[PDB]
Design a protein around this ligand. Sequence first.
Ligand SMILES: Nc1ncnc2c1ncn2[C@@H]1O[C@H](COP(=O)(O)OP(=O)(O)O)[C@@H](O)[C@H]1O
Ligand SMILES: Nc1ncnc2c1ncn2[C@@H]1O[C@H](COP(=O)(O)OP(=O)(O)O)[C@@H](O)[C@H]1O
Ligand SMILES: Nc1ncnc2c1ncn2[C@@H]1O[C@H](COP(=O)(O)OP(=O)(O)O)[C@@H](O)[C@H]1O
Lengths: 34, 24, 370, 370, 370
Amino acid sequence: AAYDKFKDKRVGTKGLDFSDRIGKTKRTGYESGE
Amino acid sequence: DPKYADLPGIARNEPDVYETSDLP
Amino acid sequence: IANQPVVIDNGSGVIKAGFAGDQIPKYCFPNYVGRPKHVRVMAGALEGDIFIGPKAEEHRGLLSIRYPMEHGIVKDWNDMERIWQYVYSKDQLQTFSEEHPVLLTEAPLNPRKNRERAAEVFFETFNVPALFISMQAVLSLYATGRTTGVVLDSGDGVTHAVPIYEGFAMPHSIMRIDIAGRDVSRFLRLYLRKEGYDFHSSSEFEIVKAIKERACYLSINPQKDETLETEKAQYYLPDGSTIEIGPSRFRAPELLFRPDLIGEESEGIHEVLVFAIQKSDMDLRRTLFSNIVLSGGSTLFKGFGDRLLSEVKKLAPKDVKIRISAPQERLYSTWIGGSILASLDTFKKMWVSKKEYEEDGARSIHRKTF
Amino acid sequence: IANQPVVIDNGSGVIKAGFAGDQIPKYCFPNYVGRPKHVRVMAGALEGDIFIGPKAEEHRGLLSIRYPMEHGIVKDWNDMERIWQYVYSKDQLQTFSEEHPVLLTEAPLNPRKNRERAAEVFFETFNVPALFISMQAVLSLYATGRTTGVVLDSGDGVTHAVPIYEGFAMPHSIMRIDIAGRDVSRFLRLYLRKEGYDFHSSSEFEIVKAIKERACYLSINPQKDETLETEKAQYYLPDGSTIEIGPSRFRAPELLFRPDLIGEESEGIHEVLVFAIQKSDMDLRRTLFSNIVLSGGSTLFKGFGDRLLSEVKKLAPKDVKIRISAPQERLYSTWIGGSILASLDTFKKMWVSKKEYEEDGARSIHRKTF
Amino acid sequence: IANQPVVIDNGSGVIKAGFAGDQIPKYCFPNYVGRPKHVRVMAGALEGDIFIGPKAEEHRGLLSIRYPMEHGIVKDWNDMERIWQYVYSKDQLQTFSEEHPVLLTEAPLNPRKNRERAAEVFFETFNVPALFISMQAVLSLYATGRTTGVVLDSGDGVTHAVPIYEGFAMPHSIMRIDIAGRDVSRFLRLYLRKEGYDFHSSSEFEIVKAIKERACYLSINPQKDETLETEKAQYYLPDGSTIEIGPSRFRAPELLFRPDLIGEESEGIHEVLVFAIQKSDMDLRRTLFSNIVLSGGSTLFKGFGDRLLSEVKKLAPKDVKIRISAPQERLYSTWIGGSILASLDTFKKMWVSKKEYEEDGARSIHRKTF
Ligand SMILES: Nc1ncnc2c1ncn2[C@@H]1O[C@H](COP(=O)(O)OP(=O)(O)O)[C@@H](O)[C@H]1O
Ligand SMILES: Nc1ncnc2c1ncn2[C@@H]1O[C@H](COP(=O)(O)OP(=O)(O)O)[C@@H](O)[C@H]1O
Ligand SMILES: Nc1ncnc2c1ncn2[C@@H]1O[C@H](COP(=O)(O)OP(=O)(O)O)[C@@H](O)[C@H]1O
């Protein structure tokens, strides 16, 4: 049932970088599931 | 100054004033 | 084909949208953009980096609030255009902007380039049949149903008084002041920090606004309540925590009557009203005191009428009859006016067609704006 | 990739392994390497100097136990690599490491050098197609099937609380403490010596762990039950000898709520949960109290829910609804989450490829991992 | 009696005490109360449960540290009263509180209740002849010997900027931010945990503060120093163990310019300085850029002036002369000002007498505060 609920959910991994880099303001990983 | 020098928290080997260039 | 025109009240606080003939605005949402501050980690999360209206109201804690328009001037046009795009979305109205004409309501004595740029959007981006910009004061008169009357419209963004006699507006007697509802909320915040309650976040500032709207009374005599020890009325926060508001309740709203408190050397709202009448010709002055109309959200403070009436009486000439009429629907008077005006057959001649804009450009909309 | 990804739950106590789609972890064995301390004299005796999983459990008496990982940090990498080799061996999954992708589940706020070295092994020693490291808290939400909730995951190695709202995680509100299940076992051993029961050997410490799981209840009032004369509850040891545990049953596990007992300057498990919520925005605090999810084996103590709810209620604000939800499979929740996430097609984009690692290096793991 | 007044600089980090006329503060000690956490077993052991100043620094390992004041606001008054009692004791100034007047230096925009309770102590608990509360910024001008200048006082507890022109202080242009030196120490601690060095104890946090002061430089360009390989500067702990700080050296102090790093929705320190000047009238803005005075301990970072001037230059108007003057005694400037002000005969009219307080009460302090 959990798989069926989350089955069609997607994430935007383009431009993804979680690391402690100061350059270029704030970042938020996984933009959208478009 | 030798009077304030006795204190532990004194700035040494630093410029007194920071200022912008007069010439563009 | 002449489709039913859409009325859009471009308020700084809340945008009120509906069709001409509608009794109430069907779609009313706050005029700010909310973007998520926190990072998305889990799949099946809230989609989109932009939230507008009820979607931003429910998830306020997650989002960072940014107001695109301050004191009736649009600082960020990209955000305001996206908000006007949302007005015609599947959530609100559910119609094409190319099919229906548009009626916009701007504040008096605004910059020319602000109005010009706003119009460009509705003629260039949105291929609207016709656009008519209207004054806030004139629409309030259609709503009230009076040709003669002084309209003191104290909004969230700006406060202004426009004296209009038998449908004639005196363009030299118009007085607008930047101090409005938004400044009182910032001024109240200063008193909350002095009591020891910090509200740094943009999400927390909306609670300070809610505290002002819920628990704030305008004292008839300032000094009496200043000298006397207050009850320190408690307010319950969303989380469950209790704060003591105390003297900040009545000290915050004084800003409207005393700009000296924030340090701005401007006239008080009571001086604006009387001065605007005193500028008029000697025989009309008496009628304008007799017919005073209150509008705008910042008039909704408890005891507003009693305090204003006392201040106007002190400044007004002796033995003059002063009758201040305040409609119960103060907030919705501007929109109701737009609906009445838009429904009139004459309105078809009033607006500027898309074709006329393309030929003459900004010149056309600048001629028919007042 | 056609080959199913392998889920590896690198727990301090027991490693849970299996393929994505599987309902329960097929392969669960204790996380330690047992070496024979006694001398081999006869021909036909037990072969090998290394015993892992059920072979170590069967012939425990011969072996000296040595845990490679402490508080989710690999102390001996040579031993940890051999256990990962054991996961792929004929006794466990019996598959090639280069054919299947890997999903690793480490605790939050671990050292960067641990994550870097751990990854290096799966690209250098094992020629894995792609590696993705995931957080324990996020996976627990996939198992429960909820986007919003606070996950209090008290493991054997580490106890941490991560508040996540509609997928979004607040990384600054994450609280981690080294004190966990293994520390209570050591703390109980202290009371067993005071009572007069010696368990010096590494094998005898595993019996102390079994005693803890069998006979320990969490008192609602600790000072009351400490003063009152306790019933001497007898436990039968593997050899046949009977030991009276007595008051040590409830005095030992109290460490979770009172870290001052061992003498560590840290917050109690009840303070960790509430403090993590209090750091979150004012609007979301009431919803986070409403959605509390328990995880880890260290919550299985009798009266945990009763004691925790009493402690949270005292720290929490007045007139707030506090609902603590316990999944029936508390121990297996984290792994099941991994299987659910791994089965999703969105997981394919999340991967760090072998080729990508070789080009960027350690940077790729830090960039793509949370 | 006109006994010489005592100047007390109630700083968040270190309290600076001495008599008026003194060139430097004689008695400077850390602002916290250390209590012994371990049990006393011996009969000749250290006497007392309260250690303040050099006794606490020497025997730090035994004690549990707890700061009574946070962001310049006294949380525990019982502890604050004992510290003022210690100022008068044989270890520090060694004088009667009844004989000498006092000069107190509080931060701007503090709660009214804070001053009221603080005053009660010096008039009721201590029978002080007279008390005068003064601003930190105004005293800095007496120390520097300049009537016109902006005083950016970035302390351990609080950072604030007060623009003062030819003696006149603009109260509406004063900007205060909670983020200060103590927050950078906590933010650095997070990076040490990521490297794999735990400092849970209150005593161990004081070593982290010492590490920051010894080895921490402010990057002129963050992207350059982020890209370039950082030199791993080793620090030796009391036991002998070495720690390599590495890239965390410059990442920690960046918090002052970017509060979004810790996750606080506030303006950067560089915005605070420029915004405070921009709030002032057009005529004074150019002179305020000409007369900028740096103060506080958080300005002592290597390359602070170079980075600040670059950030101010970007925000400031084009082709304006920006001269930032830093006194060599940045830490001691506030107290030196206090001694200069206190030495004046005009000071007799400035302070509030014990009898004057008893008659009027708290009201006298509130009138003269600013
Ligand atoms: N009950 C109330 N008491 C006091 N102030 C109020 C009350 N309700 C609203 N306000 C103030 O009035 C504002 C609404 O302004 P509004 O009339 O919508 O502006 P506009 O004319 O630009 O559309 C609110 O943001 C708030 O500051
Ligand atoms: N019934 C029980 N009662 C009390 N403690 C238990 C019980 N079962 C397991 N534990 C404790 O929980 C531990 C299991 O931790 P676990 O949740 O598997 O770790 P991780 O989450 O790090 O993989 C055991 O080693 C033991 O200390
Ligand atoms: N050399 C230094 N480099 C960087 N920061 C320093 C240095 N010396 C002290 N600090 C910081 O400044 C703080 C001192 O603040 P202080 O000037 O005492 O504030 P206050 O005005 O509240 O008395 C210390 O706690 C430390 O965080």
